[PDB]
GROMACS .gro file of C-alpha atoms in nm:
model
  173
    1UNK     CA    1   0.014   0.022   0.004
    2UNK     CA    2   0.269   0.254  -0.124
    3UNK     CA    3   0.019   0.555  -0.170
    4UNK     CA    4  -0.148   0.406   0.175
    5UNK     CA    5   0.156   0.449   0.346
    6UNK     CA    6   0.284   0.786   0.218
    7UNK     CA    7  -0.034   0.955   0.302
    8UNK     CA    8   0.030   0.770   0.668
    9UNK     CA    9   0.349   0.950   0.687
   10UNK     CA   10   0.185   1.280   0.569
   11UNK     CA   11   0.219   1.292   0.222
   12UNK     CA   12  -0.050   1.563   0.136
   13UNK     CA   13   0.019   1.544  -0.265
   14UNK     CA   14   0.181   1.254  -0.410
   15UNK     CA   15   0.329   1.227  -0.761
   16UNK     CA   16   0.402   0.878  -0.951
   17UNK     CA   17   0.677   0.874  -1.228
   18UNK     CA   18   0.725   0.577  -1.483
   19UNK     CA   19   0.791   0.527  -1.846
   20UNK     CA   20   0.488   0.295  -1.870
   21UNK     CA   21   0.184   0.502  -1.890
   22UNK     CA   22  -0.051   0.197  -1.809
   23UNK     CA   23   0.182   0.245  -1.493
   24UNK     CA   24   0.103   0.580  -1.425
   25UNK     CA   25  -0.275   0.418  -1.436
   26UNK     CA   26  -0.277   0.209  -1.150
   27UNK     CA   27  -0.084   0.499  -0.935
   28UNK     CA   28  -0.397   0.697  -1.019
   29UNK     CA   29  -0.630   0.406  -0.925
   30UNK     CA   30  -0.454   0.392  -0.626
   31UNK     CA   31  -0.506   0.719  -0.543
   32UNK     CA   32  -0.167   0.917  -0.646
   33UNK     CA   33  -0.234   1.303  -0.692
   34UNK     CA   34   0.007   1.357  -1.003
   35UNK     CA   35   0.109   1.163  -1.303
   36UNK     CA   36   0.430   1.224  -1.404
   37UNK     CA   37   0.517   1.142  -1.845
   38UNK     CA   38   0.897   1.115  -1.885
   39UNK     CA   39   0.919   1.295  -2.277
   40UNK     CA   40   1.286   1.330  -2.248
   41UNK     CA   41   1.370   0.928  -2.344
   42UNK     CA   42   1.099   0.837  -2.608
   43UNK     CA   43   0.915   0.972  -2.882
   44UNK     CA   44   0.555   1.163  -2.884
   45UNK     CA   45   0.525   1.107  -2.526
   46UNK     CA   46   0.252   1.292  -2.516
   47UNK     CA   47   0.031   1.038  -2.632
   48UNK     CA   48   0.024   0.932  -2.291
   49UNK     CA   49  -0.074   1.241  -2.187
   50UNK     CA   50  -0.358   1.160  -2.387
   51UNK     CA   51  -0.458   0.836  -2.295
   52UNK     CA   52  -0.412   0.952  -1.977
   53UNK     CA   53  -0.658   1.237  -2.009
   54UNK     CA   54  -0.894   0.927  -2.145
   55UNK     CA   55  -0.883   0.723  -1.823
   56UNK     CA   56  -0.927   0.986  -1.635
   57UNK     CA   57  -0.627   1.191  -1.493
   58UNK     CA   58  -0.677   1.516  -1.390
   59UNK     CA   59  -0.342   1.606  -1.286
   60UNK     CA   60  -0.091   1.550  -1.571
   61UNK     CA   61   0.324   1.634  -1.534
   62UNK     CA   62   0.502   1.639  -1.840
   63UNK     CA   63   0.886   1.634  -1.831
   64UNK     CA   64   1.080   1.772  -2.147
   65UNK     CA   65   1.353   1.994  -2.237
   66UNK     CA   66   1.205   2.045  -2.598
   67UNK     CA   67   1.011   2.320  -2.670
   68UNK     CA   68   0.738   2.196  -2.987
   69UNK     CA   69   0.709   1.852  -2.720
   70UNK     CA   70   0.601   2.081  -2.422
   71UNK     CA   71   0.369   2.294  -2.649
   72UNK     CA   72   0.176   1.969  -2.750
   73UNK     CA   73   0.153   1.862  -2.375
   74UNK     CA   74   0.001   2.120  -2.281
   75UNK     CA   75  -0.264   2.123  -2.627
   76UNK     CA   76  -0.300   1.762  -2.528
   77UNK     CA   77  -0.407   1.847  -2.135
   78UNK     CA   78  -0.061   1.825  -1.938
   79UNK     CA   79  -0.130   2.057  -1.646
   80UNK     CA   80   0.252   2.108  -1.520
   81UNK     CA   81   0.529   2.149  -1.720
   82UNK     CA   82   0.867   1.978  -1.600
   83UNK     CA   83   1.211   2.132  -1.721
   84UNK     CA   84   1.582   2.121  -1.650
   85UNK     CA   85   1.700   2.386  -1.441
   86UNK     CA   86   2.045   2.295  -1.527
   87UNK     CA   87   2.046   2.423  -1.889
   88UNK     CA   88   1.592   3.144  -1.658
   89UNK     CA   89   1.468   3.337  -1.924
   90UNK     CA   90   1.272   3.029  -2.040
   91UNK     CA   91   1.006   3.049  -1.794
   92UNK     CA   92   0.832   3.332  -1.966
   93UNK     CA   93   0.840   3.150  -2.272
   94UNK     CA   94   0.673   2.894  -2.138
   95UNK     CA   95   0.424   3.092  -1.958
   96UNK     CA   96   0.324   3.247  -2.281
   97UNK     CA   97   0.321   2.926  -2.448
   98UNK     CA   98  -0.001   2.855  -2.219
   99UNK     CA   99   0.218   2.675  -1.892
  100UNK     CA  100   0.031   2.734  -1.613
  101UNK     CA  101   0.204   2.549  -1.365
  102UNK     CA  102   0.621   2.545  -1.453
  103UNK     CA  103   0.873   2.300  -1.228
  104UNK     CA  104   1.175   2.271  -1.275
  105UNK     CA  105   1.399   2.034  -1.168
  106UNK     CA  106   1.820   1.987  -1.076
  107UNK     CA  107   2.115   1.825  -0.917
  108UNK     CA  108   2.176   2.195  -0.775
  109UNK     CA  109   1.950   2.369  -0.517
  110UNK     CA  110   2.123   2.732  -0.682
  111UNK     CA  111   1.989   2.638  -0.979
  112UNK     CA  112   1.644   2.560  -0.847
  113UNK     CA  113   1.683   2.898  -0.626
  114UNK     CA  114   1.735   3.090  -0.962
  115UNK     CA  115   1.420   2.902  -1.141
  116UNK     CA  116   1.252   3.028  -0.843
  117UNK     CA  117   1.371   3.373  -0.864
  118UNK     CA  118   1.229   3.381  -1.197
  119UNK     CA  119   0.912   3.270  -1.142
  120UNK     CA  120   0.887   2.865  -1.136
  121UNK     CA  121   0.578   2.727  -0.953
  122UNK     CA  122   0.748   2.387  -0.817
  123UNK     CA  123   1.115   2.324  -0.732
  124UNK     CA  124   1.179   1.909  -0.780
  125UNK     CA  125   1.500   1.817  -0.551
  126UNK     CA  126   1.659   1.454  -0.677
  127UNK     CA  127   1.747   1.269  -0.393
  128UNK     CA  128   1.773   0.930  -0.645
  129UNK     CA  129   2.128   1.076  -0.700
  130UNK     CA  130   2.261   1.167  -0.415
  131UNK     CA  131   2.250   1.140  -0.021
  132UNK     CA  132   2.101   1.369   0.227
  133UNK     CA  133   1.882   1.562  -0.039
  134UNK     CA  134   1.689   1.672   0.211
  135UNK     CA  135   1.981   1.938   0.303
  136UNK     CA  136   1.842   2.084  -0.021
  137UNK     CA  137   1.470   2.093   0.097
  138UNK     CA  138   1.615   2.271   0.388
  139UNK     CA  139   1.810   2.593   0.230
  140UNK     CA  140   1.550   2.641  -0.031
  141UNK     CA  141   1.276   2.677   0.232
  142UNK     CA  142   1.500   2.920   0.422
  143UNK     CA  143   1.555   3.130   0.092
  144UNK     CA  144   1.169   3.132   0.025
  145UNK     CA  145   1.064   2.879  -0.182
  146UNK     CA  146   0.716   2.750  -0.076
  147UNK     CA  147   0.639   2.451  -0.302
  148UNK     CA  148   0.932   2.164  -0.333
  149UNK     CA  149   0.873   1.841  -0.441
  150UNK     CA  150   1.122   1.561  -0.382
  151UNK     CA  151   1.217   1.220  -0.579
  152UNK     CA  152   1.321   0.944  -0.372
  153UNK     CA  153   1.242   0.552  -0.313
  154UNK     CA  154   1.380   0.535   0.028
  155UNK     CA  155   1.109   0.576   0.290
  156UNK     CA  156   1.334   0.743   0.600
  157UNK     CA  157   1.476   0.955   0.322
  158UNK     CA  158   1.114   1.010   0.194
  159UNK     CA  159   1.029   1.088   0.569
  160UNK     CA  160   1.296   1.330   0.609
  161UNK     CA  161   1.194   1.529   0.298
  162UNK     CA  162   0.854   1.598   0.481
  163UNK     CA  163   1.005   1.664   0.820
  164UNK     CA  164   1.179   1.912   0.611
  165UNK     CA  165   0.903   2.078   0.455
  166UNK     CA  166   0.857   1.914   0.109
  167UNK     CA  167   0.519   1.947  -0.021
  168UNK     CA  168   0.525   1.700  -0.332
  169UNK     CA  169   0.667   1.296  -0.278
  170UNK     CA  170   0.763   1.196  -0.614
  171UNK     CA  171   0.812   0.832  -0.619
  172UNK     CA  172   0.926   0.593  -0.920
  173UNK     CA  173   0.704   0.326  -1.004
   0.00000   0.00000   0.00000
C-alpha cells in the first residue's frame, strides 16, 4: 500500500513517475495526485498524456526539454511542465506558450533557487542520485521556496523530506 503509507507518513501530495503509462494509471487508481510522463527518453510522449486524460487522470505533469514537445503536451492536457534547471529566461516563454504550472528540476539547489527567482512554481529536488538531499529542501525553504517536490525511493529519506518541508513526494513506479 505505497500510496496509503505515503499518506500515513504525512504526504499531502503524491506524484508517480514511470515510463509506462499503464503504471501511471494504476497509480491513479491507487490515489496518486500527480502522474508524471517522461518525454526526455521516448517519442511522442504526449500520446501518454492523451491516454491518461481519456482514462480519467486530472493532473498530469510532463517532463521535457524540447519546446515543440512541451507545447504539444499542453495542447493534449498536461497541467504541469517539468523542465531542466541545469540548462531562466525560458520561464516567461513557457508562460506565453500557455504553461499554468512550471516545475524545474536540478541536482543543484542553486539552480532551483534561480528558477524560483524567475517565477518557477515548483522546485524538484532529486534524491535518487545523491545522499542527504533533504538538506536542499532545508536551504530552499529558508530562501523563500514554498512549493518543493522531492524525488526519492527510500522511505526514511522521503519522511525526512516531509519533515524538512517538502510539499510533493515523487516516487518511481
